[PDB]
Amino acid sequence: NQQHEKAIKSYFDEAQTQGVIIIKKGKNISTYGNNLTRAHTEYVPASTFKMLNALIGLENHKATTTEIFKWDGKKRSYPMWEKDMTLGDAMALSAVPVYQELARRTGLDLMQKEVKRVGFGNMNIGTQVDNFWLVGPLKITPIQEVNFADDFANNRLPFKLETQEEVKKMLLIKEFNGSKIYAKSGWGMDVTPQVGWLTGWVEKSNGEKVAFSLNIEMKQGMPGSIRNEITYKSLENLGII
């Protein structure tokens, strides 16, 4: 344990920021990093919330996986997003306007009841249905995120199995020789300090799943790819990949 703890701490120190990565193997949770107090600190979920937004919208018949969300011509933050696309396309791009459209279909009352029912973070979505995961009031700790990811990996979230499978398919980001990474990034740019997330699980070819949640402070000039770099170095050190 001491050797893994020192090595994983060193990956955050090398990144010149403060962070944790939580690992869930079976019944056991482990916390690593260079500022362990982050593990029980609440942060906005940022785009990690897209996982739950998608589950809620599909379960309640507000969308399907083949539906095309049309661009309405309004200016978006990235020209790439100014196109028609599916929920899965938008998941991979973190295209917030598509997920705002979905959230508005669900509506405030149903969204709040669902977030409370799932027990996600502090469970408060407030009164602004289309930005609550970006700026608050909804906040969640890294340990809460890893437990969400662990449930999702094992089809234990309180949604139909088919709904969980549909959203899982939107989250494949990488494969290492038979080991697949299902994860969602987040970057809260409208809070201070900024928060970076990568939450998901490793799915091994034998069916085993290991959930993880990386949480870091994003610094000025720091690349988004640092989230993946720290995560993969940590998973490799632990022998998970």
PDB file of C-alpha atoms in Angstrom:
ATOM      1  CA  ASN A   1       0.000   0.000   0.000  1.00  0.00           C
ATOM      2  CA  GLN A   2       2.719   2.479   0.965  1.00  0.00           C
ATOM      3  CA  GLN A   3       4.473   2.010  -2.390  1.00  0.00           C
ATOM      4  CA  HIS A   4       1.276   2.506  -4.422  1.00  0.00           C
ATOM      5  CA  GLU A   5       0.294   5.485  -2.270  1.00  0.00           C
ATOM      6  CA  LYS A   6       3.673   7.160  -2.799  1.00  0.00           C
ATOM      7  CA  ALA A   7       3.661   6.472  -6.552  1.00  0.00           C
ATOM      8  CA  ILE A   8       0.146   7.766  -7.164  1.00  0.00           C
ATOM      9  CA  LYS A   9       0.819  10.823  -4.992  1.00  0.00           C
ATOM     10  CA  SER A  10       3.848  11.453  -7.213  1.00  0.00           C
ATOM     11  CA  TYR A  11       1.689  11.568 -10.360  1.00  0.00           C
ATOM     12  CA  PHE A  12      -0.303  14.463  -8.887  1.00  0.00           C
ATOM     13  CA  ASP A  13       2.876  16.160  -7.663  1.00  0.00           C
ATOM     14  CA  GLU A  14       4.363  15.797 -11.168  1.00  0.00           C
ATOM     15  CA  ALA A  15       1.226  17.481 -12.547  1.00  0.00           C
ATOM     16  CA  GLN A  16       1.926  20.399 -10.165  1.00  0.00           C
ATOM     17  CA  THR A  17      -1.623  20.479  -8.799  1.00  0.00           C
ATOM     18  CA  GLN A  18      -3.692  19.046  -5.962  1.00  0.00           C
ATOM     19  CA  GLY A  19      -5.921  16.052  -6.518  1.00  0.00           C
ATOM     20  CA  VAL A  20      -7.176  12.611  -5.606  1.00  0.00           C
ATOM     21  CA  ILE A  21      -8.117   9.455  -7.419  1.00  0.00           C
ATOM     22  CA  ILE A  22     -10.615   7.136  -5.727  1.00  0.00           C
ATOM     23  CA  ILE A  23     -10.561   3.447  -6.686  1.00  0.00           C
ATOM     24  CA  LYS A  24     -13.358   0.977  -5.967  1.00  0.00           C
ATOM     25  CA  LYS A  25     -12.550  -2.736  -6.228  1.00  0.00           C
ATOM     26  CA  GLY A  26     -15.466  -4.902  -5.176  1.00  0.00           C
ATOM     27  CA  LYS A  27     -16.577  -3.983  -1.665  1.00  0.00           C
ATOM     28  CA  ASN A  28     -13.497  -1.835  -0.932  1.00  0.00           C
ATOM     29  CA  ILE A  29     -12.786   1.846  -1.624  1.00  0.00           C
ATOM     30  CA  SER A  30      -9.247   3.259  -1.644  1.00  0.00           C
ATOM     31  CA  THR A  31      -8.214   6.928  -1.770  1.00  0.00           C
ATOM     32  CA  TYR A  32      -4.955   8.075  -3.376  1.00  0.00           C
ATOM     33  CA  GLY A  33      -3.479  11.446  -4.255  1.00  0.00           C
ATOM     34  CA  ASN A  34      -1.574  14.402  -2.857  1.00  0.00           C
ATOM     35  CA  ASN A  35      -4.460  16.181  -1.091  1.00  0.00           C
ATOM     36  CA  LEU A  36      -6.588  13.450   0.438  1.00  0.00           C
ATOM     37  CA  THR A  37      -9.061  15.927   1.964  1.00  0.00           C
ATOM     38  CA  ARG A  38     -10.476  16.419  -1.544  1.00  0.00           C
ATOM     39  CA  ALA A  39     -12.035  12.925  -1.338  1.00  0.00           C
ATOM     40  CA  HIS A  40     -14.833  14.183   0.963  1.00  0.00           C
ATOM     41  CA  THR A  41     -15.024  17.717  -0.467  1.00  0.00           C
ATOM     42  CA  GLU A  42     -18.015  18.643  -2.618  1.00  0.00           C
ATOM     43  CA  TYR A  43     -17.457  20.075  -6.110  1.00  0.00           C
ATOM     44  CA  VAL A  44     -19.772  20.829  -9.005  1.00  0.00           C
ATOM     45  CA  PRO A  45     -20.056  17.680 -11.160  1.00  0.00           C
ATOM     46  CA  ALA A  46     -19.636  19.666 -14.386  1.00  0.00           C
ATOM     47  CA  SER A  47     -20.009  17.418 -17.472  1.00  0.00           C
ATOM     48  CA  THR A  48     -19.838  14.225 -15.358  1.00  0.00           C
ATOM     49  CA  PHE A  49     -23.529  14.965 -14.774  1.00  0.00           C
ATOM     50  CA  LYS A  50     -24.194  14.108 -18.441  1.00  0.00           C
ATOM     51  CA  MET A  51     -24.152  10.440 -17.418  1.00  0.00           C
ATOM     52  CA  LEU A  52     -27.128  10.937 -15.097  1.00  0.00           C
ATOM     53  CA  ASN A  53     -28.843  13.476 -17.385  1.00  0.00           C
ATOM     54  CA  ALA A  54     -28.797  10.853 -20.165  1.00  0.00           C
ATOM     55  CA  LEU A  55     -30.084   8.056 -17.898  1.00  0.00           C
ATOM     56  CA  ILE A  56     -32.981  10.234 -16.699  1.00  0.00           C
ATOM     57  CA  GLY A  57     -33.893  11.466 -20.173  1.00  0.00           C
ATOM     58  CA  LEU A  58     -33.891   8.013 -21.757  1.00  0.00           C
ATOM     59  CA  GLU A  59     -35.743   6.366 -18.865  1.00  0.00           C
ATOM     60  CA  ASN A  60     -38.527   8.983 -18.971  1.00  0.00           C
ATOM     61  CA  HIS A  61     -38.975   8.755 -22.769  1.00  0.00           C
ATOM     62  CA  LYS A  62     -37.642  12.266 -23.377  1.00  0.00           C
ATOM     63  CA  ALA A  63     -35.119  11.081 -25.986  1.00  0.00           C
ATOM     64  CA  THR A  64     -33.692   7.999 -27.662  1.00  0.00           C
ATOM     65  CA  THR A  65     -30.165   7.007 -28.653  1.00  0.00           C
ATOM     66  CA  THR A  66     -30.932   7.445 -32.374  1.00  0.00           C
ATOM     67  CA  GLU A  67     -32.769  10.776 -32.096  1.00  0.00           C
ATOM     68  CA  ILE A  68     -31.006  13.650 -33.852  1.00  0.00           C
ATOM     69  CA  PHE A  69     -30.849  16.850 -31.782  1.00  0.00           C
ATOM     70  CA  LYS A  70     -30.930  19.629 -34.366  1.00  0.00           C
ATOM     71  CA  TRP A  71     -28.849  22.773 -34.110  1.00  0.00           C
ATOM     72  CA  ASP A  72     -31.109  25.828 -33.832  1.00  0.00           C
ATOM     73  CA  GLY A  73     -28.570  28.264 -35.289  1.00  0.00           C
ATOM     74  CA  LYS A  74     -27.731  29.891 -31.956  1.00  0.00           C
ATOM     75  CA  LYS A  75     -24.074  30.573 -31.242  1.00  0.00           C
ATOM     76  CA  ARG A  76     -22.379  27.730 -29.381  1.00  0.00           C
ATOM     77  CA  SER A  77     -19.057  27.802 -27.550  1.00  0.00           C
ATOM     78  CA  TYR A  78     -17.289  25.699 -30.214  1.00  0.00           C
ATOM     79  CA  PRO A  79     -17.989  25.701 -33.977  1.00  0.00           C
ATOM     80  CA  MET A  80     -17.810  21.884 -33.850  1.00  0.00           C
ATOM     81  CA  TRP A  81     -20.989  21.917 -31.751  1.00  0.00           C
ATOM     82  CA  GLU A  82     -22.945  23.897 -34.371  1.00  0.00           C
ATOM     83  CA  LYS A  83     -24.358  20.788 -36.029  1.00  0.00           C
ATOM     84  CA  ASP A  84     -27.091  18.204 -35.618  1.00  0.00           C
ATOM     85  CA  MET A  85     -26.010  15.317 -33.391  1.00  0.00           C
ATOM     86  CA  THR A  86     -27.120  12.433 -31.172  1.00  0.00           C
ATOM     87  CA  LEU A  87     -26.877  12.139 -27.389  1.00  0.00           C
ATOM     88  CA  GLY A  88     -23.861   9.872 -27.875  1.00  0.00           C
ATOM     89  CA  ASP A  89     -22.154  12.355 -30.177  1.00  0.00           C
ATOM     90  CA  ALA A  90     -22.750  15.087 -27.607  1.00  0.00           C
ATOM     91  CA  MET A  91     -21.497  12.880 -24.769  1.00  0.00           C
ATOM     92  CA  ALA A  92     -18.115  12.363 -26.427  1.00  0.00           C
ATOM     93  CA  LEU A  93     -17.816  16.092 -27.259  1.00  0.00           C
ATOM     94  CA  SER A  94     -19.188  17.237 -23.879  1.00  0.00           C
ATOM     95  CA  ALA A  95     -21.583  19.366 -25.970  1.00  0.00           C
ATOM     96  CA  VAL A  96     -23.470  21.064 -23.164  1.00  0.00           C
ATOM     97  CA  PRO A  97     -26.242  22.699 -25.293  1.00  0.00           C
ATOM     98  CA  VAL A  98     -27.595  19.280 -26.331  1.00  0.00           C
ATOM     99  CA  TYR A  99     -27.759  18.204 -22.683  1.00  0.00           C
ATOM    100  CA  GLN A 100     -29.386  21.512 -21.724  1.00  0.00           C
ATOM    101  CA  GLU A 101     -32.077  20.762 -24.313  1.00  0.00           C
ATOM    102  CA  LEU A 102     -32.540  17.314 -22.782  1.00  0.00           C
ATOM    103  CA  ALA A 103     -32.713  18.753 -19.255  1.00  0.00           C
ATOM    104  CA  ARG A 104     -35.421  21.193 -20.351  1.00  0.00           C
ATOM    105  CA  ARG A 105     -37.522  18.309 -21.724  1.00  0.00           C
ATOM    106  CA  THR A 106     -37.213  16.479 -18.418  1.00  0.00           C
ATOM    107  CA  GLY A 107     -38.139  19.680 -16.584  1.00  0.00           C
ATOM    108  CA  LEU A 108     -37.290  20.964 -13.130  1.00  0.00           C
ATOM    109  CA  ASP A 109     -39.757  18.935 -11.070  1.00  0.00           C
ATOM    110  CA  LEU A 110     -38.970  15.533 -12.586  1.00  0.00           C
ATOM    111  CA  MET A 111     -35.230  16.259 -12.710  1.00  0.00           C
ATOM    112  CA  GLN A 112     -35.238  17.143  -9.007  1.00  0.00           C
ATOM    113  CA  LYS A 113     -37.215  14.046  -8.045  1.00  0.00           C
ATOM    114  CA  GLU A 114     -34.831  11.855 -10.061  1.00  0.00           C
ATOM    115  CA  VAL A 115     -31.640  13.406  -8.683  1.00  0.00           C
ATOM    116  CA  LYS A 116     -33.008  12.961  -5.159  1.00  0.00           C
ATOM    117  CA  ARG A 117     -34.118   9.380  -5.865  1.00  0.00           C
ATOM    118  CA  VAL A 118     -30.673   8.426  -7.199  1.00  0.00           C
ATOM    119  CA  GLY A 119     -29.039  10.095  -4.184  1.00  0.00           C
ATOM    120  CA  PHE A 120     -26.550  12.047  -6.332  1.00  0.00           C
ATOM    121  CA  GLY A 121     -24.297  14.336  -4.296  1.00  0.00           C
ATOM    122  CA  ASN A 122     -26.085  16.964  -2.212  1.00  0.00           C
ATOM    123  CA  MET A 123     -29.223  16.217  -4.277  1.00  0.00           C
ATOM    124  CA  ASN A 124     -30.162  19.864  -4.942  1.00  0.00           C
ATOM    125  CA  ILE A 125     -30.728  21.105  -8.493  1.00  0.00           C
ATOM    126  CA  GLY A 126     -32.173  24.475  -7.463  1.00  0.00           C
ATOM    127  CA  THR A 127     -34.416  26.441  -9.803  1.00  0.00           C
ATOM    128  CA  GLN A 128     -32.360  26.804 -13.034  1.00  0.00           C
ATOM    129  CA  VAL A 129     -32.887  23.518 -14.880  1.00  0.00           C
ATOM    130  CA  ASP A 130     -30.202  24.100 -17.535  1.00  0.00           C
ATOM    131  CA  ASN A 131     -27.062  25.068 -15.598  1.00  0.00           C
ATOM    132  CA  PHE A 132     -27.216  23.484 -12.130  1.00  0.00           C
ATOM    133  CA  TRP A 133     -24.441  20.956 -12.820  1.00  0.00           C
ATOM    134  CA  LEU A 134     -22.066  23.677 -14.065  1.00  0.00           C
ATOM    135  CA  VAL A 135     -22.361  26.340 -11.368  1.00  0.00           C
ATOM    136  CA  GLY A 136     -24.271  24.706  -8.522  1.00  0.00           C
ATOM    137  CA  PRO A 137     -26.217  24.223  -6.414  1.00  0.00           C
ATOM    138  CA  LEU A 138     -25.606  20.541  -7.201  1.00  0.00           C
ATOM    139  CA  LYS A 139     -22.286  19.353  -5.776  1.00  0.00           C
ATOM    140  CA  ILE A 140     -20.764  15.916  -5.225  1.00  0.00           C
ATOM    141  CA  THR A 141     -17.607  14.461  -3.638  1.00  0.00           C
ATOM    142  CA  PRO A 142     -15.082  12.229  -5.422  1.00  0.00           C
ATOM    143  CA  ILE A 143     -16.081   9.308  -3.177  1.00  0.00           C
ATOM    144  CA  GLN A 144     -19.730   9.874  -4.112  1.00  0.00           C
ATOM    145  CA  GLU A 145     -18.717   9.910  -7.798  1.00  0.00           C
ATOM    146  CA  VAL A 146     -16.813   6.620  -7.502  1.00  0.00           C
ATOM    147  CA  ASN A 147     -19.814   4.997  -5.815  1.00  0.00           C
ATOM    148  CA  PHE A 148     -22.056   6.243  -8.638  1.00  0.00           C
ATOM    149  CA  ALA A 149     -19.595   4.835 -11.185  1.00  0.00           C
ATOM    150  CA  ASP A 150     -19.376   1.518  -9.298  1.00  0.00           C
ATOM    151  CA  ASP A 151     -23.168   1.178  -9.328  1.00  0.00           C
ATOM    152  CA  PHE A 152     -23.297   2.112 -13.024  1.00  0.00           C
ATOM    153  CA  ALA A 153     -20.566  -0.389 -13.927  1.00  0.00           C
ATOM    154  CA  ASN A 154     -22.535  -3.135 -12.182  1.00  0.00           C
ATOM    155  CA  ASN A 155     -25.969  -2.115 -13.543  1.00  0.00           C
ATOM    156  CA  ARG A 156     -27.045  -1.305  -9.962  1.00  0.00           C
ATOM    157  CA  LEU A 157     -28.294   2.224 -10.560  1.00  0.00           C
ATOM    158  CA  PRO A 158     -32.093   2.465 -10.112  1.00  0.00           C
ATOM    159  CA  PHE A 159     -32.912   2.554 -13.831  1.00  0.00           C
ATOM    160  CA  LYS A 160     -33.875  -0.186 -16.262  1.00  0.00           C
ATOM    161  CA  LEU A 161     -30.966  -2.385 -17.300  1.00  0.00           C
ATOM    162  CA  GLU A 162     -31.483  -1.422 -20.941  1.00  0.00           C
ATOM    163  CA  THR A 163     -31.216   2.278 -20.091  1.00  0.00           C
ATOM    164  CA  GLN A 164     -27.913   1.753 -18.266  1.00  0.00           C
ATOM    165  CA  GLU A 165     -26.569  -0.261 -21.218  1.00  0.00           C
ATOM    166  CA  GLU A 166     -27.576   2.479 -23.669  1.00  0.00           C
ATOM    167  CA  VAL A 167     -25.705   5.171 -21.740  1.00  0.00           C
ATOM    168  CA  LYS A 168     -22.697   2.894 -21.124  1.00  0.00           C
ATOM    169  CA  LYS A 169     -22.261   2.580 -24.899  1.00  0.00           C
ATOM    170  CA  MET A 170     -21.829   6.368 -25.116  1.00  0.00           C
ATOM    171  CA  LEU A 171     -18.901   6.334 -22.663  1.00  0.00           C
ATOM    172  CA  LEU A 172     -16.206   4.125 -24.251  1.00  0.00           C
ATOM    173  CA  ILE A 173     -13.111   6.342 -24.445  1.00  0.00           C
ATOM    174  CA  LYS A 174     -10.105   3.990 -24.642  1.00  0.00           C
ATOM    175  CA  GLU A 175      -9.014   0.361 -24.764  1.00  0.00           C
ATOM    176  CA  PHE A 176      -5.850  -1.276 -23.399  1.00  0.00           C
ATOM    177  CA  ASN A 177      -5.374  -4.835 -24.773  1.00  0.00           C
ATOM    178  CA  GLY A 178      -8.840  -6.139 -23.859  1.00  0.00           C
ATOM    179  CA  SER A 179      -9.401  -3.688 -20.971  1.00  0.00           C
ATOM    180  CA  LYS A 180     -11.945  -1.004 -21.844  1.00  0.00           C
ATOM    181  CA  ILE A 181     -12.276   2.436 -20.229  1.00  0.00           C
ATOM    182  CA  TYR A 182     -15.844   3.728 -19.824  1.00  0.00           C
ATOM    183  CA  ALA A 183     -15.623   7.231 -18.402  1.00  0.00           C
ATOM    184  CA  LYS A 184     -16.876  10.817 -18.547  1.00  0.00           C
ATOM    185  CA  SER A 185     -14.646  13.865 -18.180  1.00  0.00           C
ATOM    186  CA  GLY A 186     -15.667  17.113 -16.541  1.00  0.00           C
ATOM    187  CA  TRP A 187     -14.135  20.564 -16.304  1.00  0.00           C
ATOM    188  CA  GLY A 188     -15.883  23.175 -14.198  1.00  0.00           C
ATOM    189  CA  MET A 189     -14.639  26.390 -15.795  1.00  0.00           C
ATOM    190  CA  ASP A 190     -17.330  28.615 -14.249  1.00  0.00           C
ATOM    191  CA  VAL A 191     -16.406  27.943 -10.620  1.00  0.00           C
ATOM    192  CA  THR A 192     -13.255  29.012  -8.813  1.00  0.00           C
ATOM    193  CA  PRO A 193     -10.923  27.267  -8.399  1.00  0.00           C
ATOM    194  CA  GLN A 194     -11.692  25.230 -11.506  1.00  0.00           C
ATOM    195  CA  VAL A 195     -12.344  21.508 -11.032  1.00  0.00           C
ATOM    196  CA  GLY A 196     -11.319  18.651 -13.309  1.00  0.00           C
ATOM    197  CA  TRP A 197     -12.920  15.215 -13.247  1.00  0.00           C
ATOM    198  CA  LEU A 198     -12.560  11.856 -14.925  1.00  0.00           C
ATOM    199  CA  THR A 199     -15.044   9.321 -13.562  1.00  0.00           C
ATOM    200  CA  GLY A 200     -15.852   5.844 -14.789  1.00  0.00           C
ATOM    201  CA  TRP A 201     -14.569   2.287 -14.726  1.00  0.00           C
ATOM    202  CA  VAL A 202     -12.213  -0.239 -16.262  1.00  0.00           C
ATOM    203  CA  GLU A 203     -14.026  -3.236 -17.752  1.00  0.00           C
ATOM    204  CA  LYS A 204     -11.760  -6.249 -18.090  1.00  0.00           C
ATOM    205  CA  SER A 205     -12.250  -8.969 -20.689  1.00  0.00           C
ATOM    206  CA  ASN A 206     -13.185 -11.424 -17.907  1.00  0.00           C
ATOM    207  CA  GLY A 207     -16.093  -9.194 -16.835  1.00  0.00           C
ATOM    208  CA  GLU A 208     -14.504  -7.616 -13.769  1.00  0.00           C
ATOM    209  CA  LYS A 209     -15.030  -3.903 -13.243  1.00  0.00           C
ATOM    210  CA  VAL A 210     -12.928  -1.401 -11.289  1.00  0.00           C
ATOM    211  CA  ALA A 211     -14.472   2.035 -10.804  1.00  0.00           C
ATOM    212  CA  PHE A 212     -12.444   5.220 -10.449  1.00  0.00           C
ATOM    213  CA  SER A 213     -12.918   8.952  -9.936  1.00  0.00           C
ATOM    214  CA  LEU A 214     -10.097  11.423 -10.514  1.00  0.00           C
ATOM    215  CA  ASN A 215     -10.619  14.940  -9.137  1.00  0.00           C
ATOM    216  CA  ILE A 216      -8.047  17.735  -9.523  1.00  0.00           C
ATOM    217  CA  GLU A 217      -7.723  21.494  -9.456  1.00  0.00           C
ATOM    218  CA  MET A 218      -7.308  22.694 -13.050  1.00  0.00           C
ATOM    219  CA  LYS A 219      -4.570  25.343 -13.354  1.00  0.00           C
ATOM    220  CA  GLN A 220      -4.095  28.108 -15.904  1.00  0.00           C
ATOM    221  CA  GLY A 221      -2.540  26.628 -19.033  1.00  0.00           C
ATOM    222  CA  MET A 222      -3.050  23.040 -17.871  1.00  0.00           C
ATOM    223  CA  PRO A 223      -4.245  20.680 -20.638  1.00  0.00           C
ATOM    224  CA  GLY A 224      -7.452  18.687 -20.312  1.00  0.00           C
ATOM    225  CA  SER A 225      -5.441  15.577 -21.233  1.00  0.00           C
ATOM    226  CA  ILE A 226      -3.729  15.714 -17.821  1.00  0.00           C
ATOM    227  CA  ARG A 227      -6.857  14.077 -16.374  1.00  0.00           C
ATOM    228  CA  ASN A 228      -6.394  11.001 -18.560  1.00  0.00           C
ATOM    229  CA  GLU A 229      -2.620  10.979 -18.044  1.00  0.00           C
ATOM    230  CA  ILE A 230      -2.823  10.862 -14.238  1.00  0.00           C
ATOM    231  CA  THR A 231      -5.669   8.334 -14.336  1.00  0.00           C
ATOM    232  CA  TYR A 232      -3.881   5.905 -16.635  1.00  0.00           C
ATOM    233  CA  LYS A 233      -0.570   6.160 -14.757  1.00  0.00           C
ATOM    234  CA  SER A 234      -2.449   5.408 -11.531  1.00  0.00           C
ATOM    235  CA  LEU A 235      -4.402   2.462 -12.957  1.00  0.00           C
ATOM    236  CA  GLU A 236      -1.190   1.037 -14.444  1.00  0.00           C
ATOM    237  CA  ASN A 237       0.671   1.380 -11.144  1.00  0.00           C
ATOM    238  CA  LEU A 238      -2.137  -0.545  -9.418  1.00  0.00           C
ATOM    239  CA  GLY A 239      -2.034  -3.291 -12.061  1.00  0.00           C
ATOM    240  CA  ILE A 240      -5.627  -2.590 -13.113  1.00  0.00           C
ATOM    241  CA  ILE A 241      -4.439  -1.966 -16.678  1.00  0.00           C
TER     242      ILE A 241
END
